[PDB]
Ligand SMILES: *[C@@H]1O[C@H](CO)[C@@H](O[C@@H]2O[C@H](CO)[C@@H](O)[C@H](O)[C@H]2NC(C)=O)[C@H](O[C@@H]2O[C@@H](C)[C@@H](O)[C@@H](O)[C@@H]2O)[C@H]1NC(C)=O
Ligand SMILES: *[C@@H]1O[C@H](CO)[C@@H](O[C@@H]2O[C@H](CO)[C@@H](O)[C@H](O)[C@H]2NC(C)=O)[C@H](O[C@@H]2O[C@@H](C)[C@@H](O)[C@@H](O)[C@@H]2O)[C@H]1NC(C)=O
């Protein structure tokens with residue numbers, strides 16, 4: 001079967017066929033999300049992703065190769081097949097390379113690159129082109145809360161009026177301070193017990209997260225998950241740690257009004 005959606009990525013911008021041209025070889029880029037046909041992507045059971053009747057195509061299968069639109073019947077078969085890993089990557093199976101936005105700006109051209117699980121490599125296939133705004137409820141039914149740039153995140157009693165408990169879940173798989181959307185939940189390293197803080201969004205692997213089906217919030221590069229340190233909310237420390245399924249690693253999003 002087939003179905004059509006937008007594809008939201010870095011900084012909440014959308015995958016867009018540049019200038020709305022359908023000529024073979026036209027690059028894909030980031031552009032602010034809308035309803036224009038050059039942002040509407042049809043996913044077919046043959047693993048093609050189509051816009052304006054043509055296919056998302058790797059113009060080469062090397063690190064740094066450009067991704068373009070191209071006639072689906074004349075492109076190389078290997079170059080038009082894509083899958084959508086549950087962590088939000090868009091992968092070309094033949095090469096193993098993944099769709100990447102190398103800069104945050106509008107008009108950045110999308111490339112196939114080595115998978116480093118970067119936030120620049122995160123995408124969401126959806127008709128809602130706005131970030132989802134939610135509280136993140138965890139251990140002891142408390143809420144995850146921001147506390148400024150460079151500072152730790154930590155747990156507090158949930159309050160409908162606390163803006164610092166309000167998170168924008170962006171299409172690039174970043175978790176952002178809703179009121180200050182240039183700031184990202186960031187692990188301060190990839191090792192167990194590294195602290196989770198807020199830092200300027202930079203596309204990094206340390207800023208990419210995945211909400212899995214076991215109630216964990218996973219950092220794909222490290223493999224490790226958000227953890228209320230020592231099950232002790234008074235420490236005011238959230239770390240990354242291996243997944244245990246314990247109550248201090250369970251989370252659920254609660255959509256905000
Ligand atoms: C695949 O392409 C990437 C983008 O060109 C390479 O990473 C980039 O390497 C640049 C130096 O050549 C570096 O200044 C860029 O910031 C970096 N981009 C990022 C953020 O990944 C990548 O090169 C590998 O990784 C980089 C960071 C260095 O460690 C290089 O020595 C590595 O070769 C390319 N991968 C390969 C396998 O060449
Ligand atoms: C993809 O490239 C194909 C090969 O060049 C195009 O099919 C060819 O379209 C020609 C111009 O319309 C037509 O004279 C040829 O007979 C046909 N060739 C073959 C081998 O089918 C194709 O065009 C689409 O498909 C054809 C069948 C017609 O329906 C066209 O009007 C379609 O545009 C190219 N696809 C696209 C979307 O451009």
Ligand SMILES: *[C@@H]1O[C@H](CO)[C@@H](O[C@@H]2O[C@H](CO)[C@@H](O)[C@H](O)[C@H]2NC(C)=O)[C@H](O)[C@H]1NC(C)=O
Pocket residue numbers: 133166178179256257
């Ligand atoms: C989250 O932050 C967003 C962005 O600042 C807030 O959305 C703005 O809200 C005002 C008032 O309703 C609107 O007029 C703007 O159009 C909104 N902007 C955007 C870009 O969406 C939002 O209210 C915040 N809180 C929640 C719960 O979503």
Ligand SMILES: *[C@@H]1O[C@H](CO)[C@@H](O)[C@H](O)[C@H]1NC(C)=O
Pocket residue numbers: 232233234235
């Ligand atoms: C939790 O952390 C606080 C703050 O550091 C500390 O005073 C308290 O003793 C800890 N509780 C436990 C059970 O370790």
